[PDB]
Motif scaffolding. Structure first.
Motif, mmCIF file in Angstrom:
data_model
loop_
_atom_site.group_PDB
_atom_site.id
_atom_site.type_symbol
_atom_site.label_atom_id
_atom_site.label_comp_id
_atom_site.label_asym_id
_atom_site.label_seq_id
_atom_site.Cartn_x
_atom_site.Cartn_y
_atom_site.Cartn_z
ATOM 1 N N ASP A 6 80.847 30.519 -67.030
ATOM 2 C CA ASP A 6 79.730 30.814 -66.104
ATOM 3 C C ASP A 6 79.776 32.278 -65.592
ATOM 4 O O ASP A 6 79.418 32.562 -64.441
ATOM 5 C CB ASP A 6 79.720 29.861 -64.920
ATOM 6 N N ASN A 7 80.259 33.184 -66.449
ATOM 7 C CA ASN A 7 80.289 34.606 -66.128
ATOM 8 C C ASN A 7 81.028 34.891 -64.817
ATOM 9 O O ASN A 7 80.604 35.759 -64.051
ATOM 10 C CB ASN A 7 78.853 35.157 -66.057
ATOM 11 N N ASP A 9 80.893 33.548 -62.335
ATOM 12 C CA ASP A 9 79.938 33.290 -61.270
ATOM 13 C C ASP A 9 79.276 34.577 -60.821
ATOM 14 O O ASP A 9 78.645 34.615 -59.756
ATOM 15 C CB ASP A 9 80.617 32.600 -60.079
ATOM 16 N N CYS A 10 79.470 35.650 -61.580
ATOM 17 C CA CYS A 10 78.789 36.910 -61.282
ATOM 18 C C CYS A 10 77.309 36.878 -61.711
ATOM 19 O O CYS A 10 76.973 36.224 -62.666
ATOM 20 C CB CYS A 10 79.478 38.075 -61.992
ATOM 21 N N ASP A 11 76.449 37.615 -60.997
ATOM 22 C CA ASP A 11 75.019 37.734 -61.329
ATOM 23 C C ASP A 11 74.843 38.692 -62.518
ATOM 24 O O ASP A 11 73.905 38.565 -63.329
ATOM 25 C CB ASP A 11 74.242 38.301 -60.116
ATOM 26 N N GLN A 12 75.745 39.672 -62.587
ATOM 27 C CA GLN A 12 75.719 40.724 -63.607
ATOM 28 C C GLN A 12 77.061 40.911 -64.289
ATOM 29 O O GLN A 12 77.543 40.016 -64.962
ATOM 30 C CB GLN A 12 75.185 42.057 -63.052
ATOM 31 N N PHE A 13 77.661 42.083 -64.146
ATOM 32 C CA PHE A 13 78.869 42.346 -64.906
ATOM 33 C C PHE A 13 80.089 41.537 -64.438
ATOM 34 O O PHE A 13 80.300 41.315 -63.242
ATOM 35 C CB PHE A 13 79.176 43.840 -64.897
ATOM 36 N N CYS A 14 80.919 41.105 -65.383
ATOM 37 C CA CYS A 14 82.142 40.416 -64.999
ATOM 38 C C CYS A 14 83.327 41.060 -65.684
ATOM 39 O O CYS A 14 83.239 41.419 -66.858
ATOM 40 C CB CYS A 14 82.035 38.940 -65.365
ATOM 41 N N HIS A 15 84.421 41.252 -64.953
ATOM 42 C CA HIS A 15 85.668 41.644 -65.587
ATOM 43 C C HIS A 15 86.859 40.928 -64.974
ATOM 44 O O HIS A 15 86.910 40.695 -63.766
ATOM 45 C CB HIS A 15 85.871 43.149 -65.502
ATOM 46 N N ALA A 26 74.689 46.781 -61.923
ATOM 47 C CA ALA A 26 74.128 47.998 -62.485
ATOM 48 C C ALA A 26 73.717 48.906 -61.342
ATOM 49 O O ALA A 26 73.632 48.476 -60.188
ATOM 50 C CB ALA A 26 72.912 47.645 -63.335
ATOM 51 N N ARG A 27 73.449 50.164 -61.662
ATOM 52 C CA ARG A 27 72.931 51.105 -60.676
ATOM 53 C C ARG A 27 71.559 50.640 -60.140
ATOM 54 O O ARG A 27 70.700 50.155 -60.901
ATOM 55 C CB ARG A 27 72.847 52.512 -61.298
ATOM 56 N N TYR A 29 71.591 48.397 -57.736
ATOM 57 C CA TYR A 29 71.963 47.155 -57.077
ATOM 58 C C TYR A 29 73.273 47.377 -56.356
ATOM 59 O O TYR A 29 74.082 48.195 -56.768
ATOM 60 C CB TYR A 29 72.197 46.054 -58.093
ATOM 61 N N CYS A 46 66.291 48.147 -61.964
ATOM 62 C CA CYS A 46 66.181 48.132 -63.429
ATOM 63 C C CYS A 46 66.223 46.705 -63.955
ATOM 64 O O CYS A 46 66.799 45.827 -63.318
ATOM 65 C CB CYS A 46 67.305 48.961 -64.062
ATOM 66 N N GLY A 47 65.619 46.458 -65.113
ATOM 67 C CA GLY A 47 65.756 45.150 -65.745
ATOM 68 C C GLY A 47 65.011 44.014 -65.056
ATOM 69 O O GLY A 47 65.035 42.885 -65.551
ATOM 70 N N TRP B 14 59.441 48.359 -69.026
ATOM 71 C CA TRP B 14 60.352 49.456 -69.430
ATOM 72 C C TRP B 14 59.878 50.104 -70.733
ATOM 73 O O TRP B 14 60.484 51.068 -71.241
ATOM 74 C CB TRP B 14 61.785 48.891 -69.572
ATOM 75 N N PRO B 106 62.405 50.670 -65.161
ATOM 76 C CA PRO B 106 63.470 50.826 -66.129
ATOM 77 C C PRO B 106 64.188 49.516 -66.499
ATOM 78 O O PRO B 106 64.255 48.574 -65.698
ATOM 79 C CB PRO B 106 64.436 51.783 -65.437
ATOM 80 N N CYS B 108 67.987 47.935 -67.637
ATOM 81 C CA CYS B 108 69.338 48.305 -67.159
ATOM 82 C C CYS B 108 70.259 48.644 -68.313
ATOM 83 O O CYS B 108 70.226 47.988 -69.365
ATOM 84 C CB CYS B 108 70.013 47.200 -66.342
ATOM 85 N N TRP B 114 81.369 44.064 -71.260
ATOM 86 C CA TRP B 114 80.630 42.900 -70.819
ATOM 87 C C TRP B 114 79.425 42.701 -71.732
ATOM 88 O O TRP B 114 79.091 41.560 -72.069
ATOM 89 C CB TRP B 114 80.173 43.049 -69.379
ATOM 90 N N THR B 196 67.586 39.275 -65.521
ATOM 91 C CA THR B 196 67.646 40.733 -65.564
ATOM 92 C C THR B 196 67.746 41.119 -67.042
ATOM 93 O O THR B 196 68.441 40.449 -67.818
ATOM 94 C CB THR B 196 68.893 41.295 -64.832
ATOM 95 N N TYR B 197 67.046 42.166 -67.445
ATOM 96 C CA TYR B 197 66.990 42.540 -68.846
ATOM 97 C C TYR B 197 67.784 43.830 -69.129
ATOM 98 O O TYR B 197 67.571 44.821 -68.474
ATOM 99 C CB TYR B 197 65.535 42.728 -69.243
#
Ligand SMILES: CO[C@H]1CN(CC(=O)Nc2ccc(-n3ccccc3=O)cc2F)C[C@@H]1NC(=O)c1ccc(Cl)s1
Ligand SMILES: [Ca+2]
Ligand code: NA
Lengths: 52, 233
Positions: A6-7, A9-15, A26-27, A29, A46-47, B14, B106, B108, B114, B196-197
Protein backbone atom coordinates in the motif's frame (compact mmCIF):
# COMPACT_ATOMS: atom_id res chain seq x y z
CA UNK A 1 6.99 -0.73 7.11
CA UNK A 2 7.42 -1.50 3.42
CA UNK A 3 6.78 0.61 0.34
CA UNK A 4 5.61 -2.52 -1.49
CA UNK A 5 2.59 -2.74 0.79
CA UNK A 6 0.00 0.00 0.00
CA UNK A 7 2.92 2.36 -0.80
CA UNK A 8 3.84 2.63 2.92
CA UNK A 9 0.52 4.40 3.14
CA UNK A 10 2.12 7.40 1.44
CA UNK A 11 0.04 9.59 -0.96
CA UNK A 12 3.12 10.03 -3.19
CA UNK A 13 6.74 9.02 -2.88
CA UNK A 14 7.77 6.20 -0.55
CA UNK A 15 11.21 5.17 0.63
CA UNK A 16 12.40 2.60 3.15
CA UNK A 17 14.81 4.15 5.63
CA UNK A 18 16.10 2.27 8.68
CA UNK A 19 13.47 -0.47 8.83
CA UNK A 20 10.76 2.13 8.38
CA UNK A 21 8.89 4.07 5.73
CA UNK A 22 9.53 7.74 4.87
CA UNK A 23 6.98 9.46 2.62
CA UNK A 24 7.57 12.51 0.50
CA UNK A 25 5.86 14.73 -2.01
CA UNK A 26 6.54 16.39 -5.32
CA UNK A 27 7.29 20.10 -5.49
CA UNK A 28 4.16 22.21 -4.87
CA UNK A 29 3.04 19.88 -2.11
CA UNK A 30 4.08 19.75 1.52
CA UNK A 31 4.06 16.52 3.55
CA UNK A 32 1.17 16.39 6.04
CA UNK A 33 1.84 16.33 9.75
CA UNK A 34 0.79 12.69 9.69
CA UNK A 35 3.82 11.95 7.51
CA UNK A 36 1.68 10.34 4.83
CA UNK A 37 -0.45 12.89 3.03
CA UNK A 38 0.57 15.47 0.40
CA UNK A 39 -1.04 18.86 0.75
CA UNK A 40 -0.92 21.17 -2.22
CA UNK A 41 0.47 24.68 -1.59
CA UNK A 42 -1.52 26.39 -4.37
CA UNK A 43 -4.49 26.09 -6.75
CA UNK A 44 -2.74 24.26 -9.61
CA UNK A 45 -0.45 21.64 -8.04
CA UNK A 46 1.32 19.42 -10.57
CA UNK A 47 -0.35 16.21 -11.74
CA UNK A 48 -3.85 17.29 -10.61
CA UNK A 49 -6.57 17.55 -13.21
CA UNK A 50 -8.28 20.94 -13.32
CA UNK A 51 -11.84 19.70 -12.55
CA UNK A 52 -12.99 22.32 -10.05
CA UNK B 1 -3.87 9.44 -31.21
CA UNK B 2 -5.54 6.47 -32.94
CA UNK B 3 -8.49 5.06 -30.93
CA UNK B 4 -8.86 6.55 -27.45
CA UNK B 5 -11.20 9.44 -26.69
CA UNK B 6 -11.19 13.25 -26.63
CA UNK B 7 -10.02 14.54 -23.21
CA UNK B 8 -12.85 15.86 -21.16
CA UNK B 9 -12.43 19.38 -19.81
CA UNK B 10 -9.51 19.61 -17.36
CA UNK B 11 -8.54 15.97 -17.94
CA UNK B 12 -5.26 16.64 -19.79
CA UNK B 13 -4.09 20.07 -18.59
CA UNK B 14 -0.30 19.42 -18.89
CA UNK B 15 -0.56 19.03 -22.67
CA UNK B 16 1.48 21.54 -24.69
CA UNK B 17 1.26 21.75 -28.48
CA UNK B 18 4.20 22.83 -30.65
CA UNK B 19 3.13 24.98 -33.61
CA UNK B 20 5.22 25.73 -36.67
CA UNK B 21 5.34 28.96 -38.67
CA UNK B 22 2.04 28.07 -40.41
CA UNK B 23 0.36 28.01 -36.95
CA UNK B 24 -0.03 24.19 -37.29
CA UNK B 25 0.79 21.72 -34.49
CA UNK B 26 3.37 19.12 -35.43
CA UNK B 27 4.51 17.76 -32.04
CA UNK B 28 3.29 17.78 -28.42
CA UNK B 29 5.02 18.59 -25.17
CA UNK B 30 4.41 18.39 -21.45
CA UNK B 31 4.18 21.42 -19.16
CA UNK B 32 6.55 20.92 -16.20
CA UNK B 33 6.37 24.33 -14.55
CA UNK B 34 5.53 27.90 -15.52
CA UNK B 35 8.74 28.24 -17.61
CA UNK B 36 9.48 24.71 -18.88
CA UNK B 37 8.15 22.33 -21.45
CA UNK B 38 9.32 18.77 -21.92
CA UNK B 39 9.28 17.43 -25.49
CA UNK B 40 11.13 15.12 -27.94
CA UNK B 41 14.60 16.06 -29.21
CA UNK B 42 13.57 14.78 -32.63
CA UNK B 43 10.87 17.41 -32.89
CA UNK B 44 13.43 20.22 -33.22
CA UNK B 45 14.34 19.15 -36.76
CA UNK B 46 10.78 19.25 -38.08
CA UNK B 47 10.66 23.06 -38.08
CA UNK B 48 13.18 25.76 -37.29
CA UNK B 49 10.77 28.34 -35.98
CA UNK B 50 8.10 27.18 -33.56
CA UNK B 51 6.02 28.32 -30.57
CA UNK B 52 4.19 26.63 -27.71
CA UNK B 53 0.40 26.49 -27.36
CA UNK B 54 -1.21 25.48 -24.08
CA UNK B 55 -4.81 25.33 -22.90
CA UNK B 56 -5.99 24.05 -26.24
CA UNK B 57 -8.24 21.05 -26.80
CA UNK B 58 -9.78 22.05 -30.16
CA UNK B 59 -7.52 23.61 -32.77
CA UNK B 60 -10.25 24.42 -35.30
CA UNK B 61 -12.41 26.24 -32.77
CA UNK B 62 -10.83 28.87 -30.52
CA UNK B 63 -12.09 28.99 -26.93
CA UNK B 64 -11.72 30.93 -23.66
CA UNK B 65 -8.30 30.06 -22.30
CA UNK B 66 -5.74 29.26 -24.99
CA UNK B 67 -2.36 31.03 -25.04
CA UNK B 68 0.79 31.07 -27.13
CA UNK B 69 4.25 31.23 -25.57
CA UNK B 70 7.50 31.93 -27.40
CA UNK B 71 10.52 29.72 -26.83
CA UNK B 72 13.47 31.34 -25.08
CA UNK B 73 16.08 28.57 -24.76
CA UNK B 74 16.05 25.14 -26.41
CA UNK B 75 17.78 22.53 -24.31
CA UNK B 76 18.27 19.37 -26.37
CA UNK B 77 19.97 16.24 -25.03
CA UNK B 78 23.57 16.40 -26.34
CA UNK B 79 23.47 12.66 -27.17
CA UNK B 80 20.31 12.55 -29.33
CA UNK B 81 20.77 11.47 -32.94
CA UNK B 82 18.26 10.78 -35.71
CA UNK B 83 20.41 7.75 -36.53
CA UNK B 84 19.27 5.90 -33.43
CA UNK B 85 16.58 8.10 -31.89
CA UNK B 86 18.31 7.44 -28.52
CA UNK B 87 18.34 10.26 -25.88
CA UNK B 88 15.10 11.55 -27.43
CA UNK B 89 14.36 14.31 -24.97
CA UNK B 90 14.52 18.12 -24.86
CA UNK B 91 13.42 20.84 -22.48
CA UNK B 92 12.23 24.28 -23.48
CA UNK B 93 12.33 27.47 -21.44
CA UNK B 94 9.58 29.89 -22.46
CA UNK B 95 10.04 33.63 -22.86
CA UNK B 96 6.97 34.34 -20.70
CA UNK B 97 5.76 32.13 -17.79
CA UNK B 98 2.52 30.18 -18.13
CA UNK B 99 -0.41 31.24 -15.96
CA UNK B 100 -1.91 28.01 -14.68
CA UNK B 101 -5.65 27.77 -15.11
CA UNK B 102 -8.39 25.49 -16.35
CA UNK B 103 -6.82 23.04 -18.89
CA UNK B 104 -3.38 24.50 -18.16
CA UNK B 105 -1.26 22.97 -15.39
CA UNK B 106 1.92 20.91 -14.97
CA UNK B 107 2.42 17.16 -14.68
CA UNK B 108 4.62 16.01 -11.73
CA UNK B 109 8.17 14.76 -12.06
CA UNK B 110 8.50 11.62 -9.89
CA UNK B 111 11.46 10.55 -7.75
CA UNK B 112 13.36 7.94 -9.88
CA UNK B 113 13.52 4.84 -7.64
CA UNK B 114 9.90 5.22 -6.62
CA UNK B 115 8.88 5.77 -10.24
CA UNK B 116 10.73 2.61 -11.35
CA UNK B 117 9.18 0.40 -8.71
CA UNK B 118 5.76 2.06 -8.52
CA UNK B 119 4.72 3.87 -11.73
CA UNK B 120 6.43 1.76 -14.38
CA UNK B 121 4.98 -1.35 -12.72
CA UNK B 122 1.40 -0.22 -13.22
CA UNK B 123 -0.79 -1.90 -15.77
CA UNK B 124 -1.17 1.13 -18.02
CA UNK B 125 -0.26 4.76 -18.70
CA UNK B 126 -1.91 7.66 -20.53
CA UNK B 127 -0.67 9.28 -23.73
CA UNK B 128 -2.31 12.35 -25.24
CA UNK B 129 -2.06 14.59 -28.28
CA UNK B 130 -3.57 16.32 -31.33
CA UNK B 131 -1.71 13.93 -33.67
CA UNK B 132 -3.08 11.87 -36.58
CA UNK B 133 -6.12 9.74 -35.75
CA UNK B 134 -5.02 7.00 -38.16
CA UNK B 135 -1.58 6.27 -39.69
CA UNK B 136 -2.60 7.95 -43.00
CA UNK B 137 -5.27 10.33 -41.66
CA UNK B 138 -5.30 13.94 -40.54
CA UNK B 139 -4.40 15.40 -37.18
CA UNK B 140 -7.28 15.89 -34.78
CA UNK B 141 -8.52 19.34 -33.90
CA UNK B 142 -9.69 17.89 -30.58
CA UNK B 143 -7.13 16.88 -27.95
CA UNK B 144 -7.32 13.10 -27.50
CA UNK B 145 -6.15 10.79 -24.74
CA UNK B 146 -5.52 7.04 -24.69
CA UNK B 147 -4.77 4.40 -22.08
CA UNK B 148 -1.78 2.25 -23.15
CA UNK B 149 -0.57 -0.90 -21.40
CA UNK B 150 3.08 -0.98 -20.45
CA UNK B 151 4.67 -3.54 -22.69
CA UNK B 152 7.53 -5.86 -21.61
CA UNK B 153 10.99 -4.93 -22.91
CA UNK B 154 11.84 -8.33 -24.35
CA UNK B 155 8.56 -8.54 -26.28
CA UNK B 156 9.09 -5.07 -27.58
CA UNK B 157 12.61 -5.81 -28.83
CA UNK B 158 11.34 -8.85 -30.73
CA UNK B 159 8.50 -6.86 -32.30
CA UNK B 160 10.83 -4.13 -33.43
CA UNK B 161 12.89 -3.52 -36.58
CA UNK B 162 15.01 -0.94 -34.86
CA UNK B 163 17.09 -1.07 -31.70
CA UNK B 164 15.24 -0.31 -28.49
CA UNK B 165 17.55 1.25 -25.92
CA UNK B 166 17.39 1.48 -22.14
CA UNK B 167 16.31 5.08 -22.71
CA UNK B 168 13.16 3.75 -24.40
CA UNK B 169 10.16 1.78 -23.34
CA UNK B 170 7.24 0.34 -25.26
CA UNK B 171 3.55 0.79 -24.58
CA UNK B 172 0.36 0.02 -26.52
CA UNK B 173 -1.27 -3.03 -28.10
CA UNK B 174 -0.20 -5.87 -30.31
CA UNK B 175 -3.13 -5.73 -32.74
CA UNK B 176 -5.70 -3.45 -31.06
CA UNK B 177 -5.95 -0.33 -33.25
CA UNK B 178 -5.01 2.25 -30.59
CA UNK B 179 -1.74 4.11 -30.40
CA UNK B 180 -0.01 7.48 -30.71
CA UNK B 181 0.83 8.78 -34.23
CA UNK B 182 2.51 11.53 -36.25
CA UNK B 183 1.81 14.78 -34.40
CA UNK B 184 1.80 13.25 -30.88
CA UNK B 185 5.60 13.04 -30.78
CA UNK B 186 6.99 15.10 -27.90
CA UNK B 187 3.69 14.77 -26.03
CA UNK B 188 2.93 13.37 -22.57
CA UNK B 189 2.93 9.85 -21.33
CA UNK B 190 1.84 10.01 -17.67
CA UNK B 191 0.95 7.43 -15.04
CA UNK B 192 -1.70 7.94 -12.43
CA UNK B 193 -1.00 7.18 -8.78
CA UNK B 194 -3.70 7.91 -6.23
CA UNK B 195 -5.30 10.72 -8.28
CA UNK B 196 -2.01 12.44 -9.26
CA UNK B 197 -0.40 12.08 -12.69
CA UNK B 198 3.38 11.79 -13.05
CA UNK B 199 5.48 12.16 -16.19
CA UNK B 200 6.72 8.72 -17.26
CA UNK B 201 7.24 8.86 -21.05
CA UNK B 202 7.62 11.14 -23.97
CA UNK B 203 5.92 10.03 -27.16
CA UNK B 204 8.91 9.24 -29.25
CA UNK B 205 8.44 6.92 -32.19
CA UNK B 206 6.76 3.96 -33.83
CA UNK B 207 6.85 2.11 -37.15
CA UNK B 208 3.65 3.49 -38.63
CA UNK B 209 0.82 3.88 -36.12
CA UNK B 210 -1.07 1.13 -34.38
CA UNK B 211 0.31 -1.45 -36.81
CA UNK B 212 -0.27 -5.09 -36.05
CA UNK B 213 2.67 -6.41 -34.00
CA UNK B 214 4.29 -3.04 -33.40
CA UNK B 215 4.08 -0.96 -30.27
CA UNK B 216 4.46 2.73 -29.36
CA UNK B 217 8.00 3.69 -28.33
CA UNK B 218 8.48 6.26 -25.58
CA UNK B 219 11.51 7.99 -24.14
CA UNK B 220 12.06 6.60 -20.63
CA UNK B 221 11.78 9.64 -18.47
CA UNK B 222 13.21 7.86 -15.37
CA UNK B 223 16.55 7.75 -17.15
CA UNK B 224 16.46 11.53 -17.43
CA UNK B 225 15.11 12.86 -14.19
CA UNK B 226 18.48 14.31 -13.15
CA UNK B 227 18.97 15.63 -16.70
CA UNK B 228 15.59 17.42 -16.64
CA UNK B 229 16.39 18.80 -13.19
CA UNK B 230 19.73 20.23 -14.38
CA UNK B 231 18.03 21.62 -17.46
CA UNK B 232 15.40 23.45 -15.44
CA UNK B 233 17.68 25.14 -12.89
C1 LIG C 1 2.54 7.86 -39.62
O1 LIG C 1 3.17 8.27 -38.41
C2 LIG C 1 4.38 7.58 -38.09
C3 LIG C 1 5.44 7.61 -39.19
N1 LIG C 1 6.72 7.51 -38.45
C4 LIG C 1 7.86 8.04 -39.20
C5 LIG C 1 9.14 7.53 -38.57
O2 LIG C 1 10.20 7.89 -39.06
N2 LIG C 1 9.10 6.72 -37.49
C6 LIG C 1 10.27 6.25 -36.98
C7 LIG C 1 11.07 7.10 -36.20
C8 LIG C 1 12.29 6.61 -35.71
C9 LIG C 1 12.72 5.31 -35.96
N3 LIG C 1 13.95 4.82 -35.47
C10 LIG C 1 14.08 4.15 -34.23
C11 LIG C 1 15.29 3.70 -33.80
C12 LIG C 1 16.43 3.90 -34.62
C13 LIG C 1 16.33 4.53 -35.82
C14 LIG C 1 15.08 5.01 -36.28
O3 LIG C 1 14.94 5.58 -37.36
C15 LIG C 1 11.93 4.48 -36.74
C16 LIG C 1 10.72 4.96 -37.23
F1 LIG C 1 9.99 4.10 -37.97
C17 LIG C 1 6.53 8.18 -37.14
C18 LIG C 1 5.03 8.27 -36.90
N4 LIG C 1 4.67 7.43 -35.75
C19 LIG C 1 4.72 7.89 -34.50
O4 LIG C 1 5.08 9.01 -34.29
C20 LIG C 1 4.35 7.06 -33.32
C21 LIG C 1 3.60 5.90 -33.18
C22 LIG C 1 3.51 5.49 -31.86
C23 LIG C 1 4.24 6.38 -31.11
CL1 LIG C 1 4.48 6.26 -29.31
S1 LIG C 1 5.00 7.73 -31.85
CA1 LIG D 1 -9.26 25.92 -29.21
NA1 NA E 1 0.15 -2.72 -32.58
Amino acid sequence: KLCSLDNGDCDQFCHEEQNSVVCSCARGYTLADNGKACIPTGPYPCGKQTLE
Amino acid sequence: IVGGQECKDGECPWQALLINEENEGFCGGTILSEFYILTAAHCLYQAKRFKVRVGDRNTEQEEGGEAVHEVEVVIKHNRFTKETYDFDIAVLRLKTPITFRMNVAPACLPERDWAESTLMTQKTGIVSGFGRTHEKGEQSTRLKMLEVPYVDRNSCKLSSSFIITQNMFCAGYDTKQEDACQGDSGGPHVTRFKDTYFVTGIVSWGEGCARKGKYGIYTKVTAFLKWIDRSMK
